[PDB]
Design a protein around this nucleic acid. Structure first.
Lengths: 209, 38, 176, 142
RNA sequence: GUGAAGAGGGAAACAACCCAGACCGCCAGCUAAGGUCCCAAAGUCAUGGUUAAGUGGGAAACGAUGUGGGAAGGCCCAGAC
RNA sequence: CGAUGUCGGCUCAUCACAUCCUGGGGCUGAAGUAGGUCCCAAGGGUAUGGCUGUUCGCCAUUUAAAGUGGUACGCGAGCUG
RNA sequence: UGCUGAAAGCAUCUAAGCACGAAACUUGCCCCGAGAUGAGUUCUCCCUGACCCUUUAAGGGUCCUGAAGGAACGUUGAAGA
């Protein structure tokens, strides 16, 4: 089905009754409220665009405010879009709550991971370090060789070298949802999800079987 | 079966058939006589 | 050639419709319809069915022969029908029919359920016989080949789903 | 005097619609390449795009002879190393048949900036209708 | 014989292979090798065959009811295969 | 030859398939288990140590397996020496 | 591996037709992605003045206006050379 947009609140644990600690991530999922519905007859695909949270009145621009004003909804902190599953139906301005996950049993959580900046190939690609002694001259963490010789005389595409690690979309699949709390607007999933605390998540039901 | 480049009738029940541009020897008596690729 | 030259004698009460290349034959057993090759010209001529090579095509004789035999089978498939008979050799091999699903117990860790297609009706007079009947010949040949294909006749003992007419040749172990 | 040269500001060029049902791929392709160069016009000039706009339609219904329906293989390499990627003719007709006619014509047209400009005039569709009713394409029976 | 010391056209590209030997000029004609569906000048020419393998567009001993042609021969409507 | 650094180790690969494992299958002198042999298959995977400068090899103990080759016997403006 | 089936009155998985069939192939899963110059789609927001000149054109210039928004600046960040 569709998913909901959360916010990574942090991690805790949930002691079970038989004494098994479960590492959970707390995801506050407020009222995701639908701002646009997309049909084949106008867009070629069925999908809903939701917003969540709240934004300052002076910080939302006039394009954006006109969009949310047409939808008849309070401006949120962003717009996201979920593809619909052929028998689902939503209306504009409809609110969607964490209660949707009261049946789902296992979810997939998509966020932007923590940006580690320009990372070298030992951090980035798990290259193995060369000797730390035994003669080695200024080449301890360096990548080694990068290709062959006259044949090809080029470095191939997607050679693993150093550069920006982190700060990109990653999806963690098949996380066990531990609690759905409709009162406090919370979703407790088992495990770590991507992102620092306060980062926006996207929690969908698991597509894997 | 036997992929050879000379396929032959080893028995009197063996039978040469061309399937999909491939010469084959189909036997009914002995399945060891089944051959391909002549 | 020698097959295409002999005419198909169509018996009474059998409906033959020649819509160009499409041939519909409907008798007492069911409507059954083919579409011949373009190299076959078929002519009724009020009594029988006659098959000839359409002029301008190289292998048309060969094609004509096939059309012949196919329609011959179709005539039997609207008059008497075709019947394959399979038997299950092995300790604890079971066959049953629920609706048109053949349940089979063939020494597996999971039940076998073969869905028969539309035109075919199987029976089981015994636990170790499947007598299946139908109108189209390749379809019951197909289905009998599938049921055989679940557990093929093992060579040393004979255990498997065999045809009732087919002989299964056996052999002994290596030594002793 | 000097030999006439067509001037690309003043080239008049027409719109043609061609139904590609049951045509042979290379033989249609060669006729389209001739019409898109402008080789059929007496004002042909090798550095001026003088050709016509052709709307090919029913591109998924194009025919090939022999076993080329299954044996004709379209290779391309992706730039990444082991990136040799093949696709037979029927796989291409299933995925995008426009690519079949467009690959053929593109390989028959001169390579270079001009022949890219010549290929921009070919408009291929997999169906029977086109958006270009405003340009009034007359039916080129070829 | 050519290259060396020889350009030009052809063989994709290719000293030495095929055609041919450049005094200069010309937005003139005819040709050689090689070619005429499109890139790319010129036959998607005419008549009669052959192959379906993309053979054409690598590769042998050897294998094979692929297929077109030719000359014979055994049996055969006292009925052959 | 007005310089194209040449074994081995390390780091980092990459392609071929004449396949070591895993996957499909035919024959078996294939009862089962385990095999032998041949066809298909390149997705991914495909040891740690003693000795030796060694590649190799022998040995020890693993492993589903410890593939065979090409890549300047890949890789010294990347390291060692 | 077959089913039906002739050429070859039999046989035959193939020539017409039909069904299975593997980690390879195309998808399914994850990420990038309209410079996809073939530059796409959808929603929303903003701008509704006069007047001269000429070799009268998607031409040049003067005055009045300066929107949506962006950029700069600052406080900065689990973003960052």
């Amino acid at each position: 089905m569709i998913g909901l947009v959360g916010k990574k609140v942090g991690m805790t644990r949930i002691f079970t009754e038989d004494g098994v600690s479960i590492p959970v991530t707390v995801i506050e999922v407020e009222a995701n409220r639908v701002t646009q519905v997309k049909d084949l007859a106008n867009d070629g695909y069925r999908a809903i665009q939701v917003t969540t949270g709240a934004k300052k009145a002076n910080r939302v621009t006039k394009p954006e405010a006109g969009h949310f004003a047409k939808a008849g909804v309070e401006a949120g902190r962003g717009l996201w879009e979920f593809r619909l599953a052929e028998g689902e139906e939503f209306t504009v301005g409809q609110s969607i709550s964490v209660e949707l996950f009261a049946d789902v049993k296992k979810v997939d959580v998509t966020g932007t991971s923590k940006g580690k900046g320009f990372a070298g190939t030992v951090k980035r690609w798990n290259f193995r370090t060369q000797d730390a002694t035994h003669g080695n001259s200024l080449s301890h963490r360096v990548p080694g060789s990068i290709g062959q010789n006259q044949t090809p005389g080029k470095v191939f595409k997607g050679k693993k070298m150093a550069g920006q690690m982190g700060n990109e979309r990653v999806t963690v699949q098949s996380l066990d949802v531990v609690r759905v709390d409709a009162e406090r607007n919370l979703l407790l999933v088992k495990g770590a999800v991507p992102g620092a605390t306060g980062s926006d998540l996207i929690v969908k039901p698991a597509v894997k079987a | 079966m036997k992929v050879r480049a000379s396929v032959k009738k080893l028995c009197r029940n063996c039978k040469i058939v061309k399937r999909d541009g491939v010469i084959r020897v189909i036997c009914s008596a002995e399945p060891k006589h089944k051959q391909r690729q002549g | 050639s020698r097959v295409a030259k002999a005419p198909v004698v169509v018996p009474a009460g059998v409906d033959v419709k020649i819509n160009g290349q499409v041939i519909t034959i409907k008798g007492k057993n069911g409507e059954l319809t083919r579409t011949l090759n373009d190299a076959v010209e078929v002519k009724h001529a009020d009594n029988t069915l006659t098959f000839g090579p359409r002029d301008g095509y190289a292998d048309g004789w060969a094609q004509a022969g096939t059309a012949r035999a196919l329609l011959n089978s179709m005539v039997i498939g609207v008059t008497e029908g075709f019947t394959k008979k399979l038997q299950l050799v092995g300790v604890g091999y079971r066959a049953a029919v629920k609706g048109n699903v053949i349940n089979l117990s063939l020494g597996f860790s999971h039940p076998v359920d073969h869905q028969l297609p539309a035109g075919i009706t199987a029976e089981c007079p015994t636990q170790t016989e499947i007598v299946l009947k139908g109108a189209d010949k390749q379809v019951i040949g197909q289905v009998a080949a599938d049921l055989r294909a679940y557990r093929r006749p093992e060579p040393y003992k004979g255990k498997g789903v065999r045809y009732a007419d087919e002989v299964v040749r056996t052999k002994e172990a290596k030594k002793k | 005097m000097k030999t006439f040269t067509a001037k690309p500001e003043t080239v008049k060029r027409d719109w043609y619609v061609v139904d590609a049902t049951g045509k042979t791929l290379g033989r249609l392709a060669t006729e389209l390449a001739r019409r898109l160069r402008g080789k059929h016009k007496a004002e042909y000039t090798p550095h001026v795009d003088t050709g016509d706009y052709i709307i090919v339609l029913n591109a998924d219904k194009v025919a090939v002879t022999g076993n080329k329906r299954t044996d004709k293989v379209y290779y391309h390499h992706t730039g990444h190393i082991g990136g040799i990627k093949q696709a037979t003719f029927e796989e291409m007709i299933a995925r995008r048949p426009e690519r079949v006619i467009e690959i053929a014509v593109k390989g028959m047209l001169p390579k270079g900036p001009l022949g890219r400009a010549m290929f921009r005039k070919l408009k291929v569709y997999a169906g029977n209708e086109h958006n270009h009713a405003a340009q009034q394409p007359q039916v080129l029976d070829i």
